[PDB]
Amino acid sequence: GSQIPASEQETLVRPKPLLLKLLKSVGAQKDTYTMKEVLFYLGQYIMTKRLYDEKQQHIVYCSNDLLGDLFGVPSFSVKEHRKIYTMIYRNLVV
Ligand SMILES: Cc1c(C(=O)O)ccc2c3n(nc12)[C@@H]1[C@H](C3)N(CC2CC2)[C@@]2(C(=O)Nc3cc(Cl)ccc32)[C@H]1c1cccc(Cl)c1F
Fold this sequence. Notes:
Largest sheet: 2 strands, antiparallel
Family: Belongs to the MDM2/MDM4 family.
PDB class: ligase
Protein name: E3 ubiquitin-protein ligase Mdm2
Number of helices: 5
Keywords: Inhibitor, Complex, ligase
Structural class: mainly alpha
CATH class: Mainly Alpha
Subcellular location: Nucleus, Nucleoplasm; Cytoplasm; Nucleus, Nucleolus; Nucleus
Bound molecules: Brigimadlin
Radius of gyration: 13 Å
Shape: globular
Number of strands: 4
Order of helices and strands: HEHEHEHEH
Strand content: 5-15%
C-alpha cells in the first residue's frame, strides 16, 4: 500500500492549524501546499525531531510528539503511504 497516484500527490491542499504549526517548525511558511510538499516537510520534521534513527526498519514511534496527536496513533509504518495520506487528509481544510 505504498503507491499513491500522481494526481493525489500533486493536488493543492490547505492544512488545518496543528499540521500548519508542524510545517512552519521546519521552515514551511505557506498555507497552501501540494500533498507531496506536505510529505516532504513532514519527512524533514520526523528527521529533525529524531523520530526515525533506526532506518533499517519501518516504524516511527510518535506517542511523545505532536505528530502522534496529529495522526491519532502511537506509531505508524513509513512504508504504508495510503494510511499516511488518510491521516493527513483528516488534517486538511474541507
Ligand atoms: C515506501 C518505503 C519503504 C519500502 O518500500 O519498504 C521503506 C521506507 C520508506 C520511507 N518512505 N517510504 C518508504 C518515505 C520515508 C521513509 N519517510 C521519511 C522518513 C525517513 C524519515 C517518508 C517521507 O519521505 N516523508 C514522510 C512523511 C511522513 Cl508524515 C511519514 C513518512 C515519510 C516516506 C514517504 C514518502 C513519500 C510519501 C509518503 Cl506517504 C511517505 F510516507
